[PDB]
Design a protein around this ligand. Structure first.
Ligand SMILES: *[C@H]1O[C@H](CO)[C@H](O)[C@H](O[C@@H]2O[C@H](CO)[C@H](O)[C@H](O)[C@H]2O)[C@H]1NC(C)=O
Lengths: 14, 270, 284, 21
């Protein structure tokens, strides 16, 4: 028993 | 502000002013899109120079986080300016606007990834990252009626959208638990030891971005899995980090030699 | 503690840079540092405090000299260019650029057309970056898209016949070589300010002039696509004519006025700018 | 009687998403 999790969107600021 | 978000029942409606930066200069409607998928606008109100996007809560590359008491859908508006008189130069910068929708919620396992602050005490914002910063990621699995478990991450893959099979992409974790990012260059990427619970796995990743990408964002899709809380780790079920100082792989738990297949780049069971 | 030490010597400069340049705890790679747009390699390194030294002639490595009334200013930079990621698809570190400056004190009238008997009979042209009000010179740093470059062209005014100054062409690039890629023509076709003809720019020559031997113009700031160093060099071709000579399609200063949708010379007859729209002001 | 003059280096901000307020 597994699963796919998405984290985001991660934004880079400059 | 120049961005209104209506979080409705099974859709969101975003309204954007074309005078987006407050300078009086109106951007082109077609230069605005929704989500990593770049969905086109649904309508325009010329009298107020606005542009509206409407999409299902799961369309257009949105990303859902499931917390104990809430559901959070996350997307963005992209502004990608059209080419200048001479395409070698740029007169107007791109832009990206985060969009968020919160909904209260209403034995199977629920996995989750959370972005944590450097002390791991609390969750932190998805914005404000710069090259040089560190992502602290916490993988966890809900506490069911059922038996104690041990959580593992098979692989993580960054990309420009929630689809990890798209180009470009980069493998952070691969080969069933090998944190390959910490193997190369001058990165400090590794799993944290010890764990807080056996059903929790933490790791730190040195921030990066994709060459050629002017939106400056990344998505990370991980494959998590669990085994019985007391089962011996093996080359198929492990959490290994590389250390340059000692030139070696080191598991979070288990025998040192379990990580051998990491260096070879194949940890198949065959 | 000085991250960057600059020794302005007699006919060379010597720059010393700490490898803990950002004090992030990680030392940068010596080979990732270079001097000037030419990217000259370092001359030595000292493992004692992890420094890297560059030494170059004041005219080497793509430096740029400005000649003011009483001083000489040589300008260059240190480049930090991190080496590519094990996987080229990603980028963990941005390139940086450090401005470097060196100041030195300096040391029967005639015409440039008929003759130059004296070694001393030489015109000195100069471009200066000026503040919004044109009162004084301003720093080369701190520019953003949406800002405006106020450029002042001038030619020396001593012991010669009255002159009128013109700018034949300006070209922006990533180095002092305007024939390199990428590049973009701000002024072209013998005085046509073509940047103000397109998009939503307000680029134009200023009228009237302060003196006939001075030419001012405003350029809307821009940057080059794909360039992560975020710098701009501008090389102009200046020229002079006698101060009362009629302007013509070869010697002029024309701006495009978006509000009137026409070309407008700083002086001269309106129709001298006609060849600007056709894009060819070359005599048949 | 002409001459070529160079002005620079002009340094811009590192932020490729910079916008007015
Ligand atoms: C040199 O520049 C002078 C100052 O601008 C002036 O134009 C001068 O011309 C000579 O000056 C004389 C006294 O003023 C007479 O006007 C004479 O006619 C004139 O030639 C310039 N001299 C030369 C040789 O060009």
């Amino acid at each position: 028993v597994a699963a796919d999790v998405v984290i985001g969107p991660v934004l880079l600021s400059a | 502000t120049p961005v209104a978000v209506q979080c409705q029942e099974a859709q969101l409606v975003v309204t954007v002013h074309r005078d987006l930066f407050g300078t009086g200069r109106l951007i082109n409607a077609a230069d605005l899109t929704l989500g990593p998928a770049a969905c086109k606008h649904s309508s325009l109100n010329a009298a107020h120079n606005t542009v509206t996007f409407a999409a299902g809560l799961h369309e257009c590359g949105s990303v859902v986080q499931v917390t104990p008491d809430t559901l959070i859908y996350r997307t963005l508006i992209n502004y990608d300016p059209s080419p200048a008189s001479n395409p070698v130069i740029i007169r107007t910068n791109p832009a990206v606007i985060p969009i968020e929708c919160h909904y209260p919620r209403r034995e199977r396992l629920v996995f989750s990834l959370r972005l944590m602050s450097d002390d791991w005490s609390t969750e932190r914002p998805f914005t404000g990252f710069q090259l040089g910063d560190i992502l602290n990621i916490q993988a966890e699995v809900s506490t069911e009626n059922h038996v104690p478990l041990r959580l593992f991450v098979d692989s993580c893959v960054a990309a420009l959208s929630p689809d990890g099979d798209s180009s470009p992409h980069y493998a952070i974790i691969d080969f069933n638990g090998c944190l390959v990012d910490g193997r190369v260059d001058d990165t400090s990427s590794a799993f944290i030891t010890p764990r807080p619970r056996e059903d929790v796995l933490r790791f730190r990743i040195d921030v990066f971005r994709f060459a050629g990408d002017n939106r400056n964002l990344i998505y990370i899709t991980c494959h998590l899995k669990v085994t019985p809380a007391d089962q011996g780790p093996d080359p198929q079920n492990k959490a290994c980090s590389f250390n340059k100082a000692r030139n070696t792989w080191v598991p979070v738990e288990g025998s040192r030699d379990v990580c051998n297949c990491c260096e070879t780049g194949n940890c198949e069971p065959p």
